[PDB]
Amino acid sequence: AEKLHISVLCGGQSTEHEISIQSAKNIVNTLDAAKYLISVIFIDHVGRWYLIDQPEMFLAHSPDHLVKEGSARPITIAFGDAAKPWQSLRRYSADCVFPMVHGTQGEDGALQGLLELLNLPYVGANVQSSAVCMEKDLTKTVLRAGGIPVVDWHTLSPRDATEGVYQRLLDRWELFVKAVSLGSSVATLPVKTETEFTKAVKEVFRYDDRLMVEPRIRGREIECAVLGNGAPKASLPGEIIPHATTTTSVDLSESVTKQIQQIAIDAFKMVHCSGMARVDFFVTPNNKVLVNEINTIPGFTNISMYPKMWEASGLPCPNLLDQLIELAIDRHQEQQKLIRCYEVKARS
Amino acid sequence: KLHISVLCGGQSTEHEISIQSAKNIVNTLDAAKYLISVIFIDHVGRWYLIDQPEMFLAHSPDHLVKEGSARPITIAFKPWQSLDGRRYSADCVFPMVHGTQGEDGALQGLLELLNLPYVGANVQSSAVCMEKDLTKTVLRAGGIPVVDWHTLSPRDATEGVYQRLLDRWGTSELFVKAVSLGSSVATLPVKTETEFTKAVKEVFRYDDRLMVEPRIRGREIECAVLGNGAPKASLPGEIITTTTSESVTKQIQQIAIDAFKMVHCSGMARVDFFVTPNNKVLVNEINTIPGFTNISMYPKMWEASGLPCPNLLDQLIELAIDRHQEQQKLIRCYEVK
């Protein structure tokens, strides 16, 4: 083969389905055509998989259209077939997979888990890191245990009493009642009263089986794109302003910029991330830098902060994508070596 | 009857124990309640379906593969599909792959993608329990007592580390363990600086992260936890040979339950402890797919606690289906909103 086969996964049974498609389109449009034969795997709303092997068609049409036209081919997977994991319902090659499903299934380790079972190289966080970063309270647990400054939180599960919690949190710290693992605004509720609190708790437990309460923090929402495996690099910080308006130009001191970058890298490492993460911070008026979230499959559309921050840092998106693919393949190669050496040792 | 698919084998060093766990499960599942299929994953990651449980009980899966009774399958995104075009039902999956790919969230991830009910810890909880330093990180953060540890990664300098751990733990005898691997070859006792440095090197050939722990003197005690939101603990068992103080017993059971909840486990886990001579109770590991063979501690501890294996299995399946039902409700409600 003269080119590497790249499969971009998008859609999925996730409320970020449409953003996923837009991310995938940018990636497909931006992948160096000289280096890659690009296939797009579309997962529809009921979880059916389709393969589109003409990237140009994916850029030109909605995947739903391609399904209906018949050009997007129903596929399943071929276990054990390391080279050609996709099988028409004819097998198709994949040298590396770019999981670009946001939220449920895509960032929560599920898709990563399938890809591990297929022994395929894939971009970004592995199963464990995806799961840790997906559950925001678990992320903070790991970060704080390692000494990384985070926005404080309080986890509640359905069996916990809700009475007294509001007051105790007010005493400790307006609050947010948030699903631990859901991003949609439907699952993040601002509360100003006890009554609002318990109503919000009830509401969020209709969506997620665990929630977290957070203090509403005054400060700027600063983001930083991290890239790498073992030796992560951090972009220039960007800012988002909920109405959201975004910009890669924020006027932070040399000190704060440096902190954001270093903590982003340290956080990335602390949750054992791979490939990429967008680390989202609050920076308080007193310039305290606080991690709020690590996103392992950040938006990747042409206006999305992750690629925009890198571009603003001197890394054009095509090069970014090449690096993500290289990192993915390198991780896979290293993991395969460890596995095999252990296998030999263990049975001997 | 409900269709139960028991998944075993796997690309894992615990492949053979997995087969034995599965055989016990298939042997013990109530025939009146279940139509049992076995999914066998071979060493190279190929998947096979055996729809005659008695064949699986009578023969090794490798034999069935060679004979052809273990049919190559893939998934249909009736989750299993032959490679006749036939599709096979599954109402609940019993993943029984130990260690790599079985307890580390990957298999759970696939089952999640397929919207199948399945027994045991979910992706997140599997991943947290699989990597032992992460488990301890989460447990200690929540105030659960655990054996001390120090994680090392390949890029960390080793110089002076041994001495520092000696100073922290007041013992010269340590273990250098892979964070995510169970074989004895990935757990190395060290008692000198030289042994430490050699062990670190050795383990880094097998895992990308390792953990150092002090050698703890005391009894190896285990405890089976069962349930979802309302876990119950078995009477403690001990590893000396295995076997199934009222205060210490209570600490064990309670800490096992609290540990189970703290890692957001579901269905089952075996919580492994040390109990020092001074009666200090320390969690060392949580196993989300513990051995399930006819002599394995998890089912034996339950049997000893008044819960026979067939009934244990029924509850595991009921817990899985119930979890699945609640999870679907949540995601449907969220999707609507």
XYZ file of C-alpha atoms in Angstrom:
685
model
C 0.000 0.000 0.000
C 1.168 3.530 -0.825
C -1.278 5.117 1.649
C -2.468 4.426 5.176
C -6.150 3.562 5.466
C -7.852 5.840 7.950
C -11.404 5.210 9.173
C -13.227 8.168 10.686
C -16.095 7.183 12.998
C -18.962 9.617 13.398
C -22.613 9.963 14.343
C -23.515 7.527 17.090
C -26.331 7.148 19.579
C -25.454 10.393 21.303
C -27.060 13.806 21.524
C -23.880 15.208 19.958
C -24.550 13.141 16.812
C -24.771 16.167 14.505
C -21.658 17.866 15.907
C -19.866 14.526 15.444
C -20.694 14.561 11.747
C -19.450 18.151 11.425
C -16.224 17.239 13.262
C -15.779 14.237 10.982
C -16.360 16.353 7.888
C -13.624 18.775 8.871
C -11.251 15.944 9.628
C -12.100 14.204 6.346
C -11.701 17.477 4.476
C -8.411 18.209 6.208
C -6.666 14.804 6.217
C -3.670 14.913 3.869
C -5.009 13.230 0.716
C -1.421 12.297 -0.218
C -0.998 10.167 2.906
C -4.386 8.623 3.514
C -7.160 6.654 1.929
C -10.075 7.892 3.974
C -13.143 5.837 4.872
C -15.992 7.171 6.971
C -17.903 4.927 9.311
C -21.337 6.314 10.078
C -23.228 5.071 13.121
C -26.868 6.048 12.870
C -29.293 6.846 15.667
C -30.210 3.216 16.317
C -26.576 2.136 16.289
C -26.323 0.689 12.791
C -22.931 1.037 11.104
C -22.324 2.106 7.536
C -19.120 2.576 5.610
C -18.590 5.395 3.130
C -15.454 4.817 1.064
C -15.738 7.944 -1.045
C -14.777 10.749 1.330
C -15.816 13.334 -1.249
C -19.392 12.037 -0.992
C -19.252 12.354 2.792
C -18.188 15.981 2.433
C -20.887 16.667 -0.159
C -23.877 15.034 1.537
C -25.343 14.189 4.923
C -24.563 10.628 5.926
C -28.326 10.074 6.246
C -28.607 10.930 2.546
C -25.823 8.497 1.677
C -27.582 5.775 3.612
C -30.834 6.395 1.750
C -29.113 6.610 -1.642
C -27.378 3.350 -0.821
C -23.818 4.629 -1.183
C -23.144 4.258 2.545
C -22.717 0.509 2.879
C -24.089 -1.426 5.864
C -21.171 -3.053 7.645
C -20.330 -5.127 10.614
C -16.936 -5.992 12.027
C -14.574 -8.880 11.477
C -13.075 -9.999 14.778
C -9.522 -11.261 14.585
C -8.984 -9.649 11.188
C -6.402 -7.083 12.269
C -5.958 -5.595 8.792
C -9.552 -5.431 7.513
C -11.897 -4.949 10.481
C -14.958 -3.775 8.521
C -17.079 -6.284 6.661
C -19.876 -5.451 4.255
C -23.294 -6.968 5.020
C -16.228 -7.711 1.165
C -13.813 -6.540 3.886
C -12.288 -3.067 4.189
C -8.883 -2.091 5.511
C -8.194 0.231 8.399
C -4.680 1.082 9.567
C -5.924 3.572 12.103
C -9.297 4.678 13.394
C -10.232 8.233 14.246
C -13.068 7.965 16.758
C -15.015 11.183 16.315
C -18.175 10.365 18.170
C -18.734 12.945 20.929
C -20.333 12.054 24.254
C -22.152 8.798 24.872
C -20.509 5.749 23.262
C -17.767 7.833 21.654
C -15.928 9.376 24.600
C -17.034 7.002 27.350
C -14.729 4.182 26.381
C -17.359 2.094 24.595
C -16.101 2.730 21.057
C -12.500 2.575 22.295
C -13.303 -0.818 23.831
C -14.544 -2.218 20.529
C -11.447 -0.862 18.835
C -9.246 -2.538 21.445
C -11.065 -5.820 20.826
C -10.355 -5.380 17.108
C -6.707 -4.651 17.934
C -6.922 -1.500 15.823
C -4.798 1.582 16.345
C -7.044 4.516 17.208
C -6.709 8.204 17.931
C -7.016 9.672 21.401
C -7.766 8.473 24.910
C -7.843 4.742 25.591
C -10.711 2.974 27.366
C -9.617 3.794 30.892
C -8.732 7.405 30.189
C -11.929 7.985 28.225
C -13.969 6.587 31.131
C -12.097 8.619 33.710
C -12.456 11.855 31.718
C -16.082 11.197 30.750
C -17.259 11.059 34.365
C -16.403 14.576 35.476
C -16.487 13.815 39.184
C -14.190 10.817 38.698
C -11.865 13.058 36.668
C -11.719 15.548 39.519
C -11.143 12.789 42.046
C -8.079 11.638 40.151
C -6.837 15.183 39.502
C -7.257 16.345 43.066
C -5.639 13.188 44.448
C -2.623 14.067 42.334
C -2.557 17.643 43.599
C -4.108 19.292 40.561
C -6.304 22.292 41.447
C -9.924 21.651 40.430
C -13.283 23.356 40.792
C -14.776 21.726 43.869
C -17.686 19.337 43.501
C -20.029 17.093 45.404
C -21.264 13.851 43.914
C -24.765 12.537 44.633
C -26.235 9.197 43.708
C -29.943 8.375 43.685
C -29.820 6.638 47.083
C -28.160 9.574 48.879
C -30.406 11.829 50.938
C -30.746 15.234 49.273
C -31.894 16.984 52.439
C -29.179 19.003 54.154
C -26.918 18.768 51.118
C -27.787 22.180 49.703
C -27.099 23.860 53.034
C -23.856 21.989 53.591
C -22.654 22.977 50.140
C -23.635 26.598 50.663
C -21.669 26.425 53.922
C -18.680 24.922 52.150
C -18.761 27.273 49.204
C -25.354 29.822 43.250
C -24.785 26.131 42.478
C -24.788 23.945 39.398
C -26.490 20.576 39.421
C -24.833 18.605 36.618
C -25.012 15.090 35.216
C -21.584 13.529 35.812
C -21.337 12.165 32.299
C -23.637 14.203 30.057
C -22.671 17.427 28.288
C -25.946 18.790 26.909
C -27.182 21.921 28.688
C -30.346 19.999 29.554
C -28.237 18.168 32.134
C -26.582 21.203 33.776
C -28.937 23.156 36.008
C -28.177 26.433 37.819
C -29.844 26.675 41.227
C -30.271 29.608 43.606
C -32.627 28.106 46.208
C -33.098 24.910 48.234
C -36.243 24.196 46.246
C -34.482 24.733 42.929
C -31.721 22.475 44.191
C -33.918 19.492 44.945
C -35.970 20.013 41.793
C -32.745 20.062 39.750
C -31.441 16.959 41.490
C -34.648 15.137 40.634
C -34.440 16.345 37.039
C -30.830 15.353 36.453
C -31.474 11.894 37.882
C -33.888 11.423 35.011
C -30.863 11.623 32.675
C -27.848 10.198 34.497
C -27.412 7.816 37.407
C -25.003 10.092 39.192
C -24.695 13.820 39.447
C -22.350 16.400 40.808
C -23.059 19.719 42.412
C -20.591 22.534 41.832
C -20.301 26.082 43.079
C -20.843 28.754 40.451
C -17.330 30.163 40.145
C -16.619 33.712 39.011
C -13.948 33.733 36.343
C -13.046 33.139 32.748
C -13.493 29.810 30.988
C -10.073 29.117 29.523
C -9.252 26.107 27.379
C -6.011 24.458 26.368
C -5.437 21.835 23.701
C -3.031 19.056 24.641
C -1.361 16.775 22.108
C 0.855 13.773 22.618
C 1.268 10.427 24.303
C 4.100 10.309 26.807
C 5.461 13.798 26.102
C 2.334 15.997 25.841
C 2.490 19.521 24.412
C 0.052 22.292 25.207
C -1.418 24.892 22.847
C -1.763 28.555 23.597
C -4.806 28.958 25.866
C -8.129 29.939 24.328
C -11.267 31.365 25.873
C -14.934 30.624 25.573
C -17.677 32.967 26.692
C -21.077 31.371 27.255
C -23.922 33.486 25.895
C -20.939 30.803 22.999
C -18.247 33.163 21.691
C -14.763 31.668 21.362
C -11.321 33.104 20.745
C -7.753 31.896 20.658
C -6.626 35.351 21.789
C -6.981 35.828 25.520
C -4.945 38.416 27.410
C -3.576 36.345 30.282
C -0.321 37.119 32.062
C 2.833 35.192 31.207
C 2.457 33.452 34.569
C -1.162 32.395 34.121
C -0.570 31.253 30.541
C 2.323 29.106 31.736
C 0.216 27.635 34.543
C -2.663 26.793 32.241
C -0.278 25.045 29.871
C 1.588 23.146 32.577
C -1.522 22.030 34.431
C -3.140 20.968 31.159
C -0.124 18.746 30.463
C 0.002 17.445 34.038
C -3.743 16.737 34.051
C -3.445 14.971 30.690
C -0.761 12.747 32.174
C -2.564 12.251 35.480
C -5.574 10.692 33.797
C -3.253 8.685 31.527
C -4.633 10.260 28.400
C -3.280 9.564 24.931
C -3.272 11.481 21.690
C -5.360 14.516 22.571
C -7.450 16.279 25.166
C -8.989 19.663 25.567
C -8.567 20.723 29.193
C -11.167 23.248 30.308
C -10.350 25.558 33.179
C -11.777 28.365 35.212
C -9.393 31.218 35.894
C -10.662 33.210 38.857
C -10.427 36.982 39.182
C -7.580 36.368 41.638
C -5.915 34.408 38.822
C -6.365 30.989 40.397
C -6.237 28.327 37.690
C -8.753 25.531 38.201
C -9.389 22.502 36.049
C -13.071 21.926 35.414
C -13.079 19.227 32.762
C -10.955 17.148 30.374
C -12.561 16.410 27.012
C -11.033 13.503 25.120
C -13.090 13.865 21.952
C -13.421 17.651 21.705
C -15.246 19.276 18.807
C -13.122 19.116 15.677
C -15.122 21.217 13.234
C -13.250 23.969 11.401
C -14.283 26.461 14.082
C -13.886 24.145 17.075
C -11.536 25.237 19.847
C -9.286 22.184 19.815
C -8.062 22.561 16.226
C -8.335 26.386 16.368
C -6.075 26.590 19.423
C -3.459 24.414 17.724
C -3.663 26.480 14.534
C -3.164 29.574 16.662
C -0.108 27.883 18.163
C 1.570 27.273 14.814
C 0.214 23.793 14.156
C -2.038 23.681 11.066
C -4.891 21.177 11.255
C -3.527 18.754 8.615
C -0.297 18.437 10.618
C -2.273 18.076 13.829
C -4.188 15.182 12.264
C -0.963 13.548 11.046
C 0.423 13.766 14.566
C -2.727 12.274 16.081
C -2.555 9.367 13.635
C 1.172 8.851 14.264
C 0.628 8.927 18.043
C -2.221 6.444 17.680
C -0.088 4.009 15.678
C 2.883 4.429 18.012
C 0.736 3.728 21.070
C -0.704 0.658 19.385
C 2.765 -0.630 18.490
C 4.043 -0.133 22.022
C 0.939 -1.729 23.561
C 1.269 -4.714 21.201
C 4.891 -5.221 22.269
C 4.053 -5.113 25.973
C 1.175 -7.548 25.464
C 3.261 -10.011 23.503
C 6.287 -9.890 25.819
C 4.061 -10.477 28.819
C 2.260 -13.281 27.004
C 5.551 -15.058 26.336
C 6.779 -14.548 29.885
C 3.460 -15.576 31.461
C 3.131 -18.889 29.606
C 6.818 -19.713 30.103
C -36.592 -18.766 28.841
C -34.032 -15.980 28.628
C -31.136 -16.235 26.178
C -27.876 -16.004 28.116
C -24.575 -15.657 26.253
C -21.551 -16.542 28.359
C -18.379 -14.942 27.000
C -15.043 -16.629 27.694
C -11.478 -17.116 26.554
C -10.041 -13.856 25.339
C -6.629 -12.511 24.437
C -5.573 -12.682 28.065
C -3.172 -14.710 30.166
C -6.205 -15.816 32.204
C -7.739 -17.432 29.106
C -7.805 -20.942 30.616
C -9.293 -19.858 33.961
C -11.918 -17.955 31.999
C -12.873 -21.180 30.216
C -13.124 -22.975 33.564
C -15.161 -20.110 35.025
C -17.488 -20.290 32.036
C -17.820 -24.070 32.302
C -18.912 -23.745 35.932
C -21.394 -21.022 35.011
C -22.767 -22.899 32.013
C -22.911 -26.072 34.145
C -24.758 -24.281 36.961
C -27.180 -21.956 35.185
C -30.756 -23.074 35.699
C -31.776 -24.932 32.542
C -35.436 -24.194 33.269
C -34.818 -20.437 33.093
C -32.184 -20.049 30.397
C -31.200 -20.949 26.876
C -27.439 -20.825 27.130
C -25.026 -19.879 24.362
C -21.291 -19.698 24.746
C -19.168 -17.149 22.958
C -15.545 -18.197 22.829
C -12.850 -15.682 21.985
C -9.637 -17.384 20.912
C -6.070 -16.224 21.556
C -5.993 -14.276 18.297
C -9.232 -12.423 18.974
C -11.566 -14.471 16.784
C -15.123 -14.965 18.087
C -17.117 -18.213 17.988
C -20.604 -19.167 19.042
C -21.534 -22.465 20.628
C -25.287 -22.879 20.803
C -25.154 -26.311 22.394
C -24.149 -25.694 26.009
C -23.666 -29.414 26.582
C -20.966 -29.473 23.859
C -19.139 -26.667 25.648
C -19.333 -28.653 28.870
C -18.141 -31.878 27.228
C -15.271 -30.442 25.157
C -12.659 -27.701 25.192
C -13.566 -24.664 23.114
C -10.463 -25.171 20.981
C -11.733 -28.662 20.124
C -15.121 -27.227 19.234
C -13.468 -24.632 17.038
C -11.467 -27.287 15.241
C -14.525 -29.515 14.964
C -16.597 -26.578 13.709
C -19.334 -26.671 16.339
C -17.972 -23.342 17.589
C -19.181 -21.178 14.695
C -17.284 -18.035 13.712
C -19.493 -15.062 14.442
C -19.516 -11.335 14.240
C -21.916 -8.852 15.730
C -25.050 -7.356 14.312
C -25.241 -3.683 15.240
C -30.053 -10.657 18.262
C -26.490 -9.298 18.602
C -24.589 -12.276 17.186
C -24.443 -13.129 13.488
C -22.778 -16.115 11.874
C -19.967 -15.707 9.332
C -25.949 -18.849 6.465
C -26.373 -15.253 7.688
C -28.100 -16.532 10.807
C -28.557 -14.273 13.837
C -28.540 -15.470 17.452
C -30.459 -14.020 20.408
C -29.036 -12.727 23.670
C -31.177 -11.364 26.516
C -28.215 -10.987 28.842
C -24.484 -11.451 28.488
C -22.234 -12.939 31.133
C -18.761 -11.680 30.318
C -16.396 -14.172 31.909
C -13.144 -13.083 30.372
C -10.615 -12.446 33.163
C -7.977 -9.726 32.943
C -7.021 -8.135 29.652
C -9.995 -7.133 27.477
C -12.387 -8.879 29.889
C -12.190 -6.795 33.072
C -10.690 -3.658 31.559
C -13.770 -2.150 30.020
C -13.171 -3.134 26.418
C -15.617 -6.023 26.365
C -18.064 -3.975 28.472
C -17.675 -1.182 25.920
C -18.742 -3.455 23.088
C -21.679 -4.734 25.099
C -22.656 -1.118 25.804
C -22.479 -0.325 22.077
C -24.774 -3.290 21.455
C -27.227 -2.146 24.159
C -27.045 -5.597 25.721
C -27.667 -6.238 29.391
C -24.523 -7.744 30.881
C -23.388 -8.977 34.242
C -20.917 -7.045 36.329
C -19.048 -3.768 36.322
C -19.641 -1.263 33.536
C -16.911 0.257 31.387
C -15.883 2.926 33.866
C -15.911 0.695 36.937
C -14.074 -2.089 35.086
C -11.412 0.388 33.974
C -11.061 1.841 37.500
C -10.744 -1.585 39.114
C -8.522 -3.021 36.409
C -5.719 -0.553 37.000
C -4.857 -1.100 40.595
C -3.209 2.263 41.297
C -6.262 4.060 39.892
C -8.496 1.875 42.072
C -6.523 2.845 45.134
C -6.488 6.470 44.079
C -10.272 6.495 43.953
C -10.700 4.418 47.110
C -8.268 6.432 49.223
C -9.795 9.697 48.014
C -13.104 8.460 49.412
C -11.532 7.471 52.711
C -11.334 3.713 52.138
C -8.229 2.235 53.787
C -5.864 0.778 51.176
C -2.340 -0.609 51.092
C 0.096 2.169 50.216
C 1.430 2.448 46.706
C 3.701 4.478 44.491
C 3.058 4.551 40.771
C 5.963 4.766 38.348
C 5.907 5.399 34.628
C 8.763 4.698 32.212
C 9.781 8.352 31.976
C 10.150 8.723 35.759
C 13.680 8.614 37.138
C 14.269 5.579 39.337
C 17.285 7.048 41.128
C 16.655 7.462 44.850
C 13.112 6.168 44.526
C 13.720 2.907 46.374
C 15.274 4.749 49.321
C 12.382 7.220 49.359
C 9.849 4.377 49.511
C 11.866 2.741 52.278
C 11.599 6.027 54.181
C 7.861 6.345 53.561
C 6.970 2.772 54.442
C 9.634 1.715 56.919
C 10.242 -1.604 55.205
C 12.978 -2.748 52.836
C 10.722 -5.418 51.323
C 8.588 -4.090 48.471
C 6.606 -5.386 45.533
C 7.008 -4.026 42.032
C 3.747 -4.778 40.233
C 2.268 -4.015 36.826
C -0.755 -1.797 37.432
C -3.009 -3.832 35.171
C -1.630 -7.383 35.005
C -2.372 -10.302 37.339
C 0.209 -12.971 36.423
C 2.848 -13.647 39.058
C 5.480 -12.704 36.470
C 4.241 -9.107 36.654
C 4.522 -8.984 40.458
C 8.091 -9.044 41.696
C 9.296 -8.985 45.296
C 12.305 -6.748 45.903
C 14.444 -6.272 48.984
C 17.453 -4.356 47.660
C 18.022 -1.300 45.498
C 19.436 -3.496 42.751
C 16.451 -5.824 42.823
C 14.191 -2.773 42.675
C 15.841 -1.317 39.587
C 15.891 -4.714 37.822
C 12.237 -5.348 38.701
C 11.159 -1.924 37.453
C 12.894 -2.625 34.139
C 11.343 -6.077 33.939
C 7.789 -4.968 34.635
C 8.079 -2.140 32.114
C 8.446 -4.853 29.470
C 4.881 -5.909 30.258
C 2.922 -2.815 31.306
C 3.248 0.914 30.571
C 2.818 1.735 34.238
C 3.782 0.011 37.429
C 3.156 0.405 41.103
C 5.447 -0.174 44.051
C 3.919 -1.413 47.295
C 5.371 -2.271 50.671
C 5.284 -5.924 51.627
C 2.414 -6.169 54.099
C 2.498 -8.872 56.741
C -0.897 -10.316 57.574
C -3.756 -12.424 56.303
C -4.997 -12.330 52.716
C -8.724 -11.909 53.165
C -11.364 -11.729 50.438
C -15.029 -10.754 50.351
C -17.658 -11.238 47.657
C -19.958 -8.310 46.975
C -23.281 -8.708 45.144
C -25.870 -6.166 44.022
C -26.300 -2.881 42.235
C -27.454 0.091 44.291
C -27.776 -2.034 47.427
C -24.697 -4.291 47.593
C -24.520 -7.178 50.032
C -21.276 -8.718 51.274
C -20.484 -12.375 51.812
C -18.724 -13.710 54.854
C -14.980 -13.173 54.387
C -12.882 -15.924 52.868
C -9.151 -16.347 53.340
C -6.257 -17.248 51.042
C -3.430 -19.055 52.849
C -5.287 -23.204 50.035
C -8.542 -21.328 50.653
C -11.266 -21.232 53.284
C -14.714 -19.691 53.656
C -13.282 -11.784 64.789
C -16.788 -10.278 64.761
C -15.550 -6.669 64.625
C -12.950 -7.296 61.930
C -15.469 -9.384 60.000
C -17.858 -6.434 60.049
C -15.125 -4.031 58.942
C -14.320 -6.314 56.013
C -17.900 -6.639 54.817
C -18.644 -2.957 55.278
C -15.453 -1.791 53.602
C -16.067 -4.222 50.750
C -19.495 -2.733 50.200
C -18.218 0.847 50.482
C -15.376 0.063 48.081
C -17.839 -1.461 45.627
C -19.962 1.697 45.801
C -16.959 4.017 45.607
C -15.823 2.630 42.271
C -19.451 2.599 41.091
C -19.350 -1.102 40.557
C -22.411 -3.120 39.648
C -23.431 -6.760 39.792
C -20.416 -8.155 41.592
C -16.857 -7.762 42.647
C -14.443 -9.563 44.855
C -12.676 -7.244 47.243
C -9.248 -8.455 48.306
C -7.787 -7.287 51.601
C -4.838 -7.612 53.868
C -5.573 -7.837 57.572
C -2.418 -7.004 59.554
C -1.579 -8.783 62.836
C -2.717 -5.556 64.516
C -6.074 -6.177 62.802
C -5.777 -3.225 60.454
C -7.940 -3.836 57.387
C -6.475 -2.671 54.083
C -8.027 -3.016 50.628
C -5.495 -4.177 48.073
C -7.556 -4.927 44.996
C -11.072 -5.013 43.582
C -11.715 -7.747 41.052
C -14.738 -7.177 38.835
C -14.471 -10.487 37.010
C -13.149 -12.800 39.714
C -12.643 -16.490 39.057
C -15.948 -18.301 38.813
C -14.701 -21.892 38.653
C -16.165 -24.548 40.937
C -13.395 -23.846 43.453
C -13.135 -20.075 42.978
C -13.508 -17.821 45.982
C -16.286 -15.576 44.696
C -18.993 -18.228 44.341
C -17.609 -20.289 47.248
C -17.826 -17.349 49.641
C -21.433 -16.833 48.587
C -22.270 -20.530 48.928
C -20.796 -20.290 52.420
C -23.013 -17.263 53.084
C -26.233 -19.104 52.282
C -26.334 -18.292 48.579
C -25.995 -21.365 46.321
C -24.350 -20.808 42.959
C -27.428 -21.289 40.742
C -29.244 -18.615 42.764
C -26.184 -16.374 42.724
C -26.206 -16.625 38.931
C -29.923 -15.834 38.738
C -29.371 -12.719 40.824
C -26.406 -11.668 38.708
C -28.579 -11.941 35.612
C -31.532 -10.146 37.241
C -29.190 -7.372 38.421
C -27.795 -7.009 34.908
C -31.208 -6.810 33.255
C -32.471 -4.406 35.904
C -29.422 -2.192 35.457
C -29.922 -2.279 31.709
C -33.589 -1.341 32.098
C -32.808 1.683 34.283
C -29.949 2.795 32.005
C -32.208 2.682 28.927
C -34.846 4.724 30.718
C -32.217 7.359 31.539
C -30.799 7.603 28.053
C -34.251 7.719 26.430
C -35.372 10.438 28.817
C -32.173 12.407 28.199
C -32.404 12.014 24.419
C -35.967 13.336 24.529
C -34.940 16.414 26.549
